[PDB]
Amino acid sequence: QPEPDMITIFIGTWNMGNAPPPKKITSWFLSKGQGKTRDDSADYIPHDIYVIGTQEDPLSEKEWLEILKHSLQEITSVTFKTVAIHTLWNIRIVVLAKPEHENRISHICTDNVKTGIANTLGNKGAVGVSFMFNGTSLGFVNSHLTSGSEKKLRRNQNYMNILRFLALGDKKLSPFNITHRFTHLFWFGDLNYRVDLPTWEAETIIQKIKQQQYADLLSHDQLLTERREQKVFLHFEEEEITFAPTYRFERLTRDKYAYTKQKATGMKYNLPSWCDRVLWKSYPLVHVVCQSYGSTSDIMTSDHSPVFATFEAGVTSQFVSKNGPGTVDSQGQIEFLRCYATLKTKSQTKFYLEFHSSCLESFVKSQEGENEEGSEGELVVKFGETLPKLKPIISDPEYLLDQHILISIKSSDSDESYGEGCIALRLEATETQLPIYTPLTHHGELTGHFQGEIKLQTSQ
């Protein structure tokens, strides 16, 4: 059996509204309903990996796993294997995979983050799973963020707490948060961002939904506007939304949105909103294509409709050579020329770089850069030609061109990262000086840039 170079991944997010599901939920896993839906001709073709995120989930783990497995069994005639299940309060993540992948999956990690403080600690937060699939690292986050139209800034703070504190992936990547640890990271959930229009416009909104005219509503979606203004989810992608708002429905139908203020809502309006979302972030120049993004129309036990998204995702093979793993391949090298960082810092410490990659035996520390004052105030940290020559473990171009180098710029005084980024080795040419670039972030916010030239030598 050849190792795959692509897999398909199903992502589901459903806020179940504390109610048991209906007897049939197969439409969710088939990507059928409204939006970008899956072709009927693919119904019997299993995805490689199913990742199910629930919020307000009233079921036990056993009860939900039996429903999920029996659903997929009916659709595909495949008995899926449980990779991981993790629950925080009523927030849950399940990862299922084809049985043929059991030996391809390793380094399974789970974690959760509880958001907020006192009053605001005890039901919101996130759960996550990571693992390796052959040579590819995969991360998955299911978050239930703070509710309420007037709490977008709290949701943004919940996001930053989750990506700072969720401990997934390779712990050796100590300067890096989850936004840099994975070849592919999927972040989904009841993110709770709302369509920010006046309360008086509720019936106008409903009209627009009935006309399938989502444009004037999406222009006020808080997640899209906060992303455009770089307030949250920096460097994540979302597929275009072409389905109706998934919240807040009257239960047992999808014919009615329940938006008006009630004691049960804390006297808050719930204008129709796209609360339930799937976003992703993949390393540069790795294949990732969204092939469905939509909501079901026939699952009506909750005041939310389930959301689905599916992806093609590039994967690589667990490379063995005569040499690496367990030695270098003197044939291979990575050289850096004319490199500098630009930092948005008022500090004047010296800085050095660390280079982290699973193509290295271990991470490499550079010498200190030369600080220069940027013409518009910034700090320019010059490395020129001084950066180390990296010695990959395998020099075969079929391996090396698929790799990535994580970069952290650290203070010499404190050894704290001021910025993290990633460079693809998927170059247009080898043995050729070529421009490289990454933005640098810390705690998920932009802190600067790294740029220069690279020179990659492979065995070919």
Ligand SMILES: Oc1ccc(CN2CCc3ccccc3C2)cc1
């Ligand atoms: O080649 C690229 C360059 C920039 C982006 C990031 N995008 C750009 C547009 C946009 C609009 C609204 C909210 C977020 C974003 C983020 C993606 C690909």
Ligand SMILES: Oc1ccc(CN2CCc3ccccc3C2)cc1
């Ligand atoms: O107020 C200023 C006046 C001159 C410079 C010029 N330097 C020179 C070298 C260099 C190397 C790498 C990146 C940038 C630069 C810019 C910068 C700021």
Ligand SMILES: Oc1ccc(CN2CCc3ccccc3C2)cc1
């Ligand atoms: O450590 C170095 C890194 C890059 C360069 C080459 N470039 C970088 C950009 C720039 C901008 C403005 C004036 C000059 C330059 C010189 C030189 C030294």
